[PDB]
């Protein structure tokens, strides 16, 4: 009953049998090797054990499979990593994210205002995807009318990450990066001459051990912040809201008592796990949870598998917004623990609260059909989500 899986095949993460493959992994081979020999930490304990040893499980070989390291902080180890983190993390603390609550809240109602009179919308296209793009776009200095453009580039950069990608879809990826690279490098120059307060200008004026960053790194550190912002939270928003709709009792709980929202957000994060994996590179041969790992090979941290680990969670296949503690690993753990985790939790809190309040009779358009997941091996979620609701007036 061993699953036949290629953990770099995007089709695996779009199939609804992925979690049954995870369950076999956790019970039979905690450090799993897929049909091509790729190692993966499948249990909560194995993921945590690897995260706690960056000296042995390094990021400096790149976070993706079949992909060399890039000049971004997530592909670095300390000290180099933490020097980069400290340059841009000031605005991402819990307190500094709270100062954005007012502006994030109005972006939410602006987006709901645009569909609330129609009685129908695509939850992904019209609500889930545009919120975080506007939030991180504002922090990156992206003009509001340039938001769909950056979202389109972002989609093209992550949608076709798969071991079985066609040469043409791969062309879409390198095209999107080239277009993103041209735009950003012109923005590099404008921020050099005329500095601003956006994160790009903070990056341009930064120095590490006395020297400024290269344009190659500046372009990639900006892209890391962009994709982290606009290709992650959107999937918890849509997938988590789907679970509230497929389990109406949870949706009813949240309206009857809005104080349950923070717990609902944590369960949406655990369930959806938008970042399906991150790679680590072994710096030496080791024995890890009974599996022999060789120096130089990559191992995937399977965050969704860890989030449904029965050794940690009671009844992990139940969607339960009252789960507490909910020590999920959607944001990872350790050195590279998500820098935007507080920002994503506030985006989720505010948009969900207004969906529940302003679209109170929300339901899926077709409860009997299943919504398609994105067949990619890095970030993945609902491709679309047609919903219907009783129309109301904008604010
Ligand atoms: C629900 C949404 C999100 C999820 C699931 C998520 C998940 C993750 C994960 C799994 C990692 C790697 C952690 C590890 O390997 O230990 C990560 C890192 C990161 N995330 Fe997020 N993230 C989310 C939202 C955001 C947002 C809104 C931003 C803001 C720009 C962001 C920026 C980053 C950055 C910059 C890193 C790399 C930080 C580092 O290497 O130290 N993420 N995220
Ligand atoms: C979810 C976040 C925390 C992590 C984001 C990691 C970065 C931004 C992502 C991860 C996978 C990367 C892509 C890897 C494949 C490709 C090869 C190139 O020739 C340069 C551009 C690239 C097109 C892409 C650069 C941006 C990458 C998309
Ligand atoms: Na590491």
Q: Confirm or reject: Cβ of 250 under 6 Å from ligand 2.
A: no
* 35 Cβ contact list (under 8 Å, min separation 6): 4, 5, 6
- Give the H or E element holding residue 82: helix 80-88
Cβ-contact 239, 364 below 8 angstroms: no
> In the structure encoding, which two tokens stand for residue 343, read together?
């920002």
Residue nearest to atom 2 of ligand 1 (CA): 233
Cβ-contact 159, 376 below 8 angstroms: yes
Structure-determination approach: X-ray
Q: At what angle do helices 130-140 and 215-230 cross, to 10 degrees?
A: 150
> In the structure encoding, which two tokens stand for residue 167, read together?
């040469």
Cβ-contact 338, 79 below 8 angstroms: no
Parent domain of 144: 1-395
Residue nearest to atom 21 of ligand 2 (CA): 177
| Domain count for the chain | 1
Cβ-contact 243, 266 below 8 angstroms: no
| Separation of CA 75 and ligand 3 centre (Å) | 8
- Give the H or E element holding residue 33: strand 31-33
Q: Across-strand partners of 364? A: 387
Residue nearest to atom 5 of ligand 2 (CA): 224
| Separation of CA 340 and ligand 1 centre (Å) | 6
Cβ-contact 338, 344 below 8 angstroms: yes
| Separation of CA 337 and ligand 1 centre (Å) | 7
Cβ-contact 63, 41 below 8 angstroms: no
| Backbone torsions φ then ψ of 274, nearest 5 degrees | -55, -40
Task: Give ligand 1 pocket residues (Cβ under 6 A).
Answer: 51, 73-74, 85, 132, 136, 224-225, 228-229, 232-233, 236, 269, 274-275, 278, 303, 330-334, 336-340, 343-344
| Separation of CA 341 and ligand 1 centre (Å) | 6
Nearest C-alpha neighbor of 122 from the set 362, 367, 385: 385
Resolution in A: 2.0
Determine how many CB atoms are found less than 10 A away from the CB of residue 144. 10
| Separation of CA 232 and ligand 1 centre (Å) | 8
Nearest C-alpha neighbor of 62 from the set 204, 191, 161: 161
Tell which atom from ligand 1 comes closest to the C-alpha of 139: 30
Which residues lie at CB < 5 A from ion ligand 3? 54, 59
Alpha carbon 159 to its chain centroid, in Å, reads 13
* 29 Cβ contact list (under 8 Å, min separation 6): 42, 291
């Amino acid at each position: 009953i061993k699953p036949d899986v290629d953990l770099t095949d995007g089709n695996f993460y779009a199939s609804r049998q992925a979690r049954e493959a995870y369950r076999w992994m956790r019970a039979n081979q905690p450090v799993f090797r897929d049909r091509n020999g790729l190692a993966a930490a499948s249990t909560y304990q194995a993921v945590i054990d690897a995260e706690r040893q960056p000296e042995l499980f390094s990021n400096a070989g790149g976070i993706r499979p079949d992909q060399d390291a890039l000049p971004m902080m997530i592909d670095m180890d300390d000290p180099a990593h933490l020097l980069r983190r400290k340059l841009v993390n000031a605005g991402f603390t819990r307190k500094r994210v709270k100062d954005k609550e007012r502006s994030i809240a109005q972006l939410c109602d602006t987006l709901i205002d645009a569909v609330c009179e129609r009685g129908e919308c695509d939850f992904v296209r019209d609500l889930a995807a545009p919120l975080p793009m506007a939030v991180i776009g504002d922090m990156l200095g992206v003009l509001p009318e340039q938001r769909e453009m950056f979202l389109r580039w972002s989609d093209d950069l992550v949608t076709f990450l798969s071991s079985h990608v066609s040469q043409e879809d791969f062309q879409v990826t390198i095209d999107a990066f080239a277009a993103y690279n041209d735009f950003t490098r012109a923005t590099i120059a404008a921020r050099r001459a005329e500095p601003t307060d956006d994160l790009v200008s903070v990056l341009v004026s930064s120095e590490v051990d006395g020297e400024r960053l290269s344009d190659d790194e500046l372009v990639m550190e900006t892209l890391l912040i962009l994709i982290g912002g606009d290709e992650t939270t959107r999937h918890t928003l849509s997938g988590g809201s789907e679970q509230l709709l497929r389990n109406r009792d949870q949706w009813d709980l949240l309206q009857s008592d809005r104080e349950l929202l923070p717990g609902a957000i944590e369960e949406m994060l655990r369930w959806t796990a938008p970042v399906k994996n991150m790679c680590r590179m072994l710096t030496a041969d080791t024995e890890f949870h009974g599996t022999a790992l060789s120096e130089g090979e990559k191992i995937m941290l399977l965050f969704e598998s860890a989030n449904f680990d029965e050794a940690v969670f009671t009844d992990p296949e139940k969607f339960d917004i009252q789960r507490n503690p909910n020590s999920h690993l959607a944001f990872g753990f350790g050195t590279h623990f998500c820098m935007g985790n507080q920002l994503a939790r506030l985006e989720l809190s505010l948009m969900t609260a207004r969906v529940v309040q302003r679209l109170p009779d929300l339901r899926l358009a077709d409860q009997d059909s299943r919504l398609p997941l994105r067949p990619a091996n890095f970030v993945s979620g609902l491709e679309s989500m047609p919903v219907v609701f009783t129309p109301s007036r904008p604010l």
